[PDB]
Protein backbone atom coordinates (compact mmCIF):
# COMPACT_ATOMS: atom_id res chain seq x y z
CA UNK A 1 0.00 0.00 0.00
CA UNK A 2 2.77 2.65 0.73
CA UNK A 3 5.07 4.05 -2.16
CA UNK A 4 7.74 2.36 -2.84
CA UNK A 5 11.30 4.42 -2.81
CA UNK A 6 11.72 3.54 -6.54
CA UNK A 7 8.20 5.30 -7.03
CA UNK A 8 9.48 8.38 -4.31
CA UNK A 9 12.95 8.45 -6.78
CA UNK A 10 10.80 9.24 -10.10
CA UNK A 11 10.01 12.74 -7.28
CA UNK A 12 12.72 15.02 -8.85
CA UNK A 13 13.66 18.91 -7.70
CA UNK A 14 12.60 21.10 -10.97
CA UNK A 15 12.36 25.00 -11.18
CA UNK A 16 10.43 26.77 -7.75
CA UNK A 17 8.99 22.79 -6.93
CA UNK A 18 9.46 19.40 -8.45
CA UNK A 19 8.32 17.29 -11.35
CA UNK A 20 8.03 13.26 -11.93
CA UNK A 21 9.63 11.15 -14.26
CA UNK A 22 6.90 9.06 -16.03
CA UNK A 23 9.92 7.14 -17.66
CA UNK A 24 13.35 7.32 -18.82
CA UNK A 25 12.49 10.44 -20.77
CA UNK A 26 9.45 11.68 -19.85
CA UNK A 27 9.05 14.42 -16.94
CA UNK A 28 5.66 15.78 -16.38
CA UNK A 29 5.58 18.96 -13.70
CA UNK A 30 3.28 22.13 -13.28
CA UNK A 31 3.64 24.94 -15.59
CA UNK A 32 4.34 27.26 -13.01
CA UNK A 33 7.41 26.35 -11.42
CA UNK A 34 9.14 25.97 -14.85
CA UNK A 35 12.06 27.81 -14.63
CA UNK A 36 11.91 30.94 -16.60
CA UNK A 37 14.95 32.40 -19.27
CA UNK A 38 16.79 29.55 -19.25
CA UNK A 39 18.32 27.57 -22.22
CA UNK A 40 18.29 23.73 -20.59
CA UNK A 41 16.46 21.65 -18.94
CA UNK A 42 18.65 18.68 -16.88
CA UNK A 43 21.37 19.64 -19.14
CA UNK A 44 19.56 19.36 -22.16
CA UNK A 45 19.14 22.08 -24.58
CA UNK A 46 15.51 23.12 -25.50
CA UNK A 47 16.07 21.91 -29.18
CA UNK A 48 16.47 18.67 -27.87
CA UNK A 49 13.27 18.68 -25.73
CA UNK A 50 9.71 18.33 -27.03
CA UNK A 51 8.34 20.03 -24.43
CA UNK A 52 4.12 20.22 -24.56
CA UNK A 53 2.17 22.41 -22.33
CA UNK A 54 -1.32 22.85 -21.52
CA UNK A 55 -2.40 25.39 -19.02
CA UNK A 56 -1.07 24.29 -15.37
CA UNK A 57 0.04 21.01 -17.07
CA UNK A 58 3.28 20.24 -18.57
CA UNK A 59 5.73 17.26 -20.29
CA UNK A 60 9.09 17.29 -21.36
CA UNK A 61 9.92 13.82 -23.76
CA UNK A 62 14.04 14.05 -23.62
CA UNK A 63 15.76 12.88 -26.90
CA UNK A 64 17.71 10.58 -24.73
CA UNK A 65 17.14 8.25 -21.67
CA UNK A 66 17.52 10.42 -18.52
CA UNK A 67 16.43 8.54 -16.08
CA UNK A 68 17.46 4.60 -18.10
CA UNK A 69 17.01 3.18 -14.64
CA UNK A 70 13.16 3.49 -14.17
CA UNK A 71 10.56 1.31 -16.20
CA UNK A 72 7.71 3.31 -17.83
CA UNK A 73 4.86 3.30 -16.04
CA UNK A 74 1.15 4.61 -16.57
CA UNK A 75 0.35 8.58 -17.13
CA UNK A 76 -3.47 9.07 -17.11
CA UNK A 77 -5.58 12.18 -17.17
CA UNK A 78 -7.23 12.80 -13.54
CA UNK A 79 -8.92 9.51 -11.94
CA UNK A 80 -12.59 8.62 -11.50
CA UNK A 81 -14.56 10.65 -9.28
CA UNK A 82 -14.09 9.51 -5.68
CA UNK A 83 -10.47 7.79 -6.20
CA UNK A 84 -8.10 8.04 -3.17
CA UNK A 85 -4.97 9.15 -4.60
CA UNK A 86 -1.51 9.71 -2.57
CA UNK A 87 0.72 13.55 -3.46
CA UNK A 88 4.20 12.52 -2.90
CA UNK A 89 5.38 15.53 -1.66
CA UNK A 90 9.38 15.61 -1.02
CA UNK A 91 10.28 18.67 0.93
CA UNK A 92 13.73 20.28 0.68
CA UNK A 93 15.08 19.17 3.78
CA UNK A 94 14.43 15.55 2.39
CA UNK A 95 11.44 15.22 4.42
CA UNK A 96 8.91 12.26 2.35
CA UNK A 97 5.17 13.51 3.35
CA UNK A 98 2.47 11.15 1.49
CA UNK A 99 -0.77 12.73 1.19
CA UNK A 100 -3.66 10.61 1.33
CA UNK A 101 -6.49 12.72 -1.23
CA UNK A 102 -9.74 11.69 -2.23
CA UNK A 103 -10.42 13.23 -5.84
CA UNK A 104 -13.31 14.93 -6.68
CA UNK A 105 -14.31 16.28 -10.78
CA UNK A 106 -12.13 16.88 -13.53
CA UNK A 107 -12.82 20.56 -14.74
CA UNK A 108 -11.66 23.91 -15.59
CA UNK A 109 -11.42 26.51 -13.03
CA UNK A 110 -10.42 29.71 -12.26
CA UNK A 111 -7.61 29.94 -10.00
CA UNK A 112 -6.27 33.03 -9.41
CA UNK A 113 -7.50 35.01 -12.49
CA UNK A 114 -6.13 32.23 -15.03
CA UNK A 115 -8.25 28.89 -16.18
CA UNK A 116 -6.59 25.80 -14.67
CA UNK A 117 -7.62 22.44 -16.26
CA UNK A 118 -7.51 19.99 -13.28
CA UNK A 119 -9.14 17.48 -10.87
CA UNK A 120 -9.61 19.14 -7.05
CA UNK A 121 -9.84 16.86 -3.93
CA UNK A 122 -10.20 16.93 -0.64
CA UNK A 123 -7.25 15.94 1.79
CA UNK A 124 -8.11 13.45 4.38
CA UNK A 125 -1.34 20.09 4.24
CA UNK A 126 0.89 21.25 1.00
CA UNK A 127 2.85 24.37 0.65
CA UNK A 128 3.53 26.39 -2.17
CA UNK A 129 6.76 24.62 -2.47
CA UNK A 130 5.12 21.49 -3.40
CA UNK A 131 3.70 22.44 -6.77
CA UNK A 132 4.90 19.45 -9.26
CA UNK A 133 4.75 16.70 -6.68
CA UNK A 134 2.59 13.66 -8.61
CA UNK A 135 -0.88 12.73 -7.89
CA UNK A 136 -0.43 8.28 -7.93
CA UNK A 137 -2.92 5.76 -7.02
CA UNK A 138 -2.56 1.97 -7.10
CA UNK A 139 -3.97 -0.43 -9.42
CA UNK A 140 -3.60 -3.80 -8.60
CA UNK A 141 -0.06 -4.18 -8.33
CA UNK A 142 1.37 -0.88 -10.25
CA UNK A 143 1.02 2.70 -9.57
CA UNK A 144 -0.62 4.88 -11.75
CA UNK A 145 0.26 8.61 -12.04
CA UNK A 146 -2.74 11.05 -12.58
CA UNK A 147 -1.54 14.96 -12.37
CA UNK A 148 0.76 17.58 -10.95
CA UNK A 149 0.01 19.57 -7.78
CA UNK A 150 -0.72 22.64 -8.54
CA UNK A 151 -3.09 24.69 -5.76
CA UNK A 152 -4.66 24.23 -2.65
CA UNK A 153 -7.02 26.27 -0.79
CA UNK A 154 -6.00 28.85 1.93
CA UNK A 155 -7.87 26.97 4.36
CA UNK A 156 -6.18 24.15 2.83
CA UNK A 157 -8.06 21.08 3.23
CA UNK A 158 -9.21 21.24 -0.99
CA UNK A 159 -6.31 20.83 -3.43
CA UNK A 160 -6.23 20.81 -7.09
CA UNK A 161 -3.99 19.29 -9.36
CA UNK A 162 -3.16 20.08 -13.12
CA UNK A 163 -3.56 17.21 -15.76
CA UNK A 164 -3.61 16.68 -19.37
CA UNK A 165 -5.33 18.19 -21.85
CA UNK A 166 -8.52 16.51 -23.16
CA UNK A 167 -11.93 16.01 -23.37
CA UNK A 168 -14.30 13.67 -21.94
CA UNK A 169 -17.90 12.40 -20.75
CA UNK A 170 -16.93 11.93 -17.16
CA UNK A 171 -15.35 15.46 -17.02
CA UNK A 172 -17.30 18.75 -16.64
CA UNK A 173 -16.66 20.68 -20.23
CA UNK B 1 -33.05 11.23 7.43
CA UNK B 2 -35.36 11.70 4.72
CA UNK B 3 -37.00 14.66 3.23
CA UNK B 4 -40.62 15.35 4.71
CA UNK B 5 -43.46 16.56 2.42
CA UNK B 6 -42.95 19.82 3.76
CA UNK B 7 -39.63 20.26 2.39
CA UNK B 8 -40.52 18.53 -1.27
CA UNK B 9 -43.94 21.07 -1.03
CA UNK B 10 -40.89 24.18 -1.31
CA UNK B 11 -39.93 22.67 -4.76
CA UNK B 12 -41.80 24.38 -7.33
CA UNK B 13 -42.10 24.52 -11.12
CA UNK B 14 -40.72 27.30 -12.62
CA UNK B 15 -39.68 28.28 -16.45
CA UNK B 16 -38.00 25.55 -17.58
CA UNK B 17 -37.19 23.71 -14.54
CA UNK B 18 -37.51 24.14 -11.27
CA UNK B 19 -37.36 26.41 -8.02
CA UNK B 20 -37.12 26.45 -4.51
CA UNK B 21 -38.88 28.60 -1.86
CA UNK B 22 -36.79 29.33 1.03
CA UNK B 23 -38.79 31.14 2.93
CA UNK B 24 -42.37 32.95 2.52
CA UNK B 25 -40.44 36.03 0.41
CA UNK B 26 -37.50 33.99 -1.06
CA UNK B 27 -36.92 31.63 -4.10
CA UNK B 28 -34.41 30.26 -4.97
CA UNK B 29 -33.59 28.95 -8.64
CA UNK B 30 -30.76 28.26 -11.79
CA UNK B 31 -30.11 31.52 -13.93
CA UNK B 32 -29.79 29.94 -16.90
CA UNK B 33 -34.26 28.36 -16.59
CA UNK B 34 -35.56 31.56 -15.39
CA UNK B 35 -37.89 32.45 -18.48
CA UNK B 36 -37.31 35.30 -20.80
CA UNK B 37 -39.35 38.41 -21.40
CA UNK B 38 -41.45 38.40 -18.64
CA UNK B 39 -43.52 40.78 -16.60
CA UNK B 40 -44.07 38.90 -13.70
CA UNK B 41 -43.14 35.91 -11.95
CA UNK B 42 -46.01 34.33 -10.13
CA UNK B 43 -48.27 36.78 -10.60
CA UNK B 44 -46.15 39.95 -9.09
CA UNK B 45 -44.67 42.23 -11.60
CA UNK B 46 -40.61 42.49 -11.83
CA UNK B 47 -40.50 46.11 -9.90
CA UNK B 48 -42.56 44.25 -7.06
CA UNK B 49 -39.24 41.68 -6.75
CA UNK B 50 -35.93 42.47 -5.43
CA UNK B 51 -34.15 39.83 -8.49
CA UNK B 52 -30.44 38.74 -7.25
CA UNK B 53 -28.39 37.03 -9.86
CA UNK B 54 -24.78 35.85 -10.03
CA UNK B 55 -23.77 33.73 -12.55
CA UNK B 56 -26.13 30.55 -12.30
CA UNK B 57 -27.69 31.78 -9.14
CA UNK B 58 -30.84 33.63 -8.84
CA UNK B 59 -32.42 34.86 -6.06
CA UNK B 60 -36.30 36.37 -6.05
CA UNK B 61 -37.83 38.71 -2.77
CA UNK B 62 -41.06 39.33 -3.11
CA UNK B 63 -42.47 42.35 -1.73
CA UNK B 64 -45.67 40.17 -0.28
CA UNK B 65 -45.31 36.56 1.22
CA UNK B 66 -46.19 34.01 -1.24
CA UNK B 67 -45.82 31.29 0.81
CA UNK B 68 -46.90 32.48 4.28
CA UNK B 69 -47.50 28.25 5.34
CA UNK B 70 -43.35 27.90 5.08
CA UNK B 71 -40.91 28.91 8.14
CA UNK B 72 -37.81 30.41 7.18
CA UNK B 73 -35.01 27.88 6.38
CA UNK B 74 -31.02 28.29 6.13
CA UNK B 75 -29.46 29.39 2.72
CA UNK B 76 -25.78 28.79 2.47
CA UNK B 77 -23.24 28.97 0.60
CA UNK B 78 -22.49 25.34 -0.54
CA UNK B 79 -21.30 23.01 2.00
CA UNK B 80 -17.90 21.75 3.32
CA UNK B 81 -16.20 19.24 1.24
CA UNK B 82 -17.19 15.49 1.64
CA UNK B 83 -21.03 16.52 2.84
CA UNK B 84 -23.75 14.10 1.42
CA UNK B 85 -26.61 16.47 0.33
CA UNK B 86 -29.96 15.50 -1.42
CA UNK B 87 -30.60 16.62 -4.56
CA UNK B 88 -34.59 17.22 -4.23
CA UNK B 89 -35.72 16.22 -7.73
CA UNK B 90 -39.35 16.57 -9.07
CA UNK B 91 -40.17 14.95 -12.34
CA UNK B 92 -43.15 16.66 -14.50
CA UNK B 93 -45.44 13.48 -13.84
CA UNK B 94 -45.47 14.38 -10.35
CA UNK B 95 -42.53 11.48 -9.28
CA UNK B 96 -40.33 12.24 -6.69
CA UNK B 97 -36.34 11.43 -6.72
CA UNK B 98 -34.06 12.74 -4.41
CA UNK B 99 -30.69 11.48 -5.53
CA UNK B 100 -27.32 11.23 -2.60
CA UNK B 101 -24.12 13.44 -3.61
CA UNK B 102 -21.05 13.49 -2.09
CA UNK B 103 -20.25 17.41 -2.21
CA UNK B 104 -16.70 18.37 -3.73
CA UNK B 105 -15.63 22.13 -4.16
CA UNK B 106 -16.69 25.29 -4.47
CA UNK B 107 -15.22 26.52 -7.52
CA UNK B 108 -15.90 28.98 -10.87
CA UNK B 109 -15.86 25.97 -13.75
CA UNK B 110 -16.20 26.39 -17.23
CA UNK B 111 -19.48 25.07 -18.24
CA UNK B 112 -20.27 24.73 -21.70
CA UNK B 113 -18.57 28.40 -22.58
CA UNK B 114 -19.44 30.23 -19.35
CA UNK B 115 -17.70 30.40 -15.97
CA UNK B 116 -20.15 28.96 -13.32
CA UNK B 117 -19.66 29.92 -9.59
CA UNK B 118 -21.38 26.59 -7.86
CA UNK B 119 -20.02 23.52 -6.52
CA UNK B 120 -19.34 19.71 -8.05
CA UNK B 121 -20.33 16.28 -6.47
CA UNK B 122 -20.49 12.93 -6.88
CA UNK B 123 -23.93 11.12 -7.50
CA UNK B 124 -24.05 8.29 -5.04
CA UNK B 125 -29.07 10.31 -12.73
CA UNK B 126 -29.98 14.12 -13.22
CA UNK B 127 -31.66 14.73 -16.50
CA UNK B 128 -31.87 18.43 -17.81
CA UNK B 129 -35.09 19.59 -16.97
CA UNK B 130 -34.04 18.66 -13.17
CA UNK B 131 -32.18 22.14 -13.13
CA UNK B 132 -33.10 24.50 -10.09
CA UNK B 133 -33.75 21.54 -7.82
CA UNK B 134 -32.42 22.41 -4.32
CA UNK B 135 -29.69 20.37 -2.37
CA UNK B 136 -29.99 20.16 0.68
CA UNK B 137 -28.70 18.78 3.82
CA UNK B 138 -29.75 18.01 7.39
CA UNK B 139 -28.03 19.74 9.95
CA UNK B 140 -29.01 18.52 13.69
CA UNK B 141 -33.15 18.49 13.19
CA UNK B 142 -33.09 21.25 10.34
CA UNK B 143 -32.63 21.17 7.11
CA UNK B 144 -30.41 23.22 4.75
CA UNK B 145 -30.31 24.61 1.56
CA UNK B 146 -26.99 25.17 -0.18
CA UNK B 147 -27.40 25.19 -3.72
CA UNK B 148 -29.55 24.56 -7.20
CA UNK B 149 -28.76 21.69 -9.79
CA UNK B 150 -27.56 23.40 -12.65
CA UNK B 151 -25.29 21.07 -14.54
CA UNK B 152 -24.47 17.13 -15.07
CA UNK B 153 -21.59 15.13 -17.13
CA UNK B 154 -22.40 13.71 -19.75
CA UNK B 155 -21.67 10.30 -17.85
CA UNK B 156 -24.12 11.47 -15.25
CA UNK B 157 -22.08 10.71 -12.14
CA UNK B 158 -20.27 14.31 -11.65
CA UNK B 159 -23.13 17.13 -11.35
CA UNK B 160 -22.64 20.88 -10.42
CA UNK B 161 -24.69 22.62 -8.31
CA UNK B 162 -24.94 26.87 -8.96
CA UNK B 163 -24.20 28.74 -5.69
CA UNK B 164 -24.48 32.20 -4.09
CA UNK B 165 -21.62 34.63 -5.02
CA UNK B 166 -18.93 35.08 -1.98
CA UNK B 167 -15.39 34.44 -1.47
CA UNK B 168 -14.11 32.63 1.25
CA UNK B 169 -11.21 30.79 2.19
CA UNK B 170 -13.01 26.60 1.79
CA UNK B 171 -13.50 27.46 -1.71
CA UNK B 172 -11.02 28.15 -5.14
CA UNK B 173 -10.39 31.62 -5.59
NA1 LIG C 1 -3.25 21.82 1.47
NA1 LIG D 1 -26.54 13.05 -13.41
Avoid at 40 to 60: D, K, N, R, V
Wanted: charged letters at 15%.
Amino acid sequence: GSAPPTLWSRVTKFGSGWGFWVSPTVFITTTHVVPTGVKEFFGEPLSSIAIHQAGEFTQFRFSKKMRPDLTGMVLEEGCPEGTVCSVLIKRDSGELLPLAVRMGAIASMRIQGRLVHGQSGMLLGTIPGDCGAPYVHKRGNDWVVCGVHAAATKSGNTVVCAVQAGEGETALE
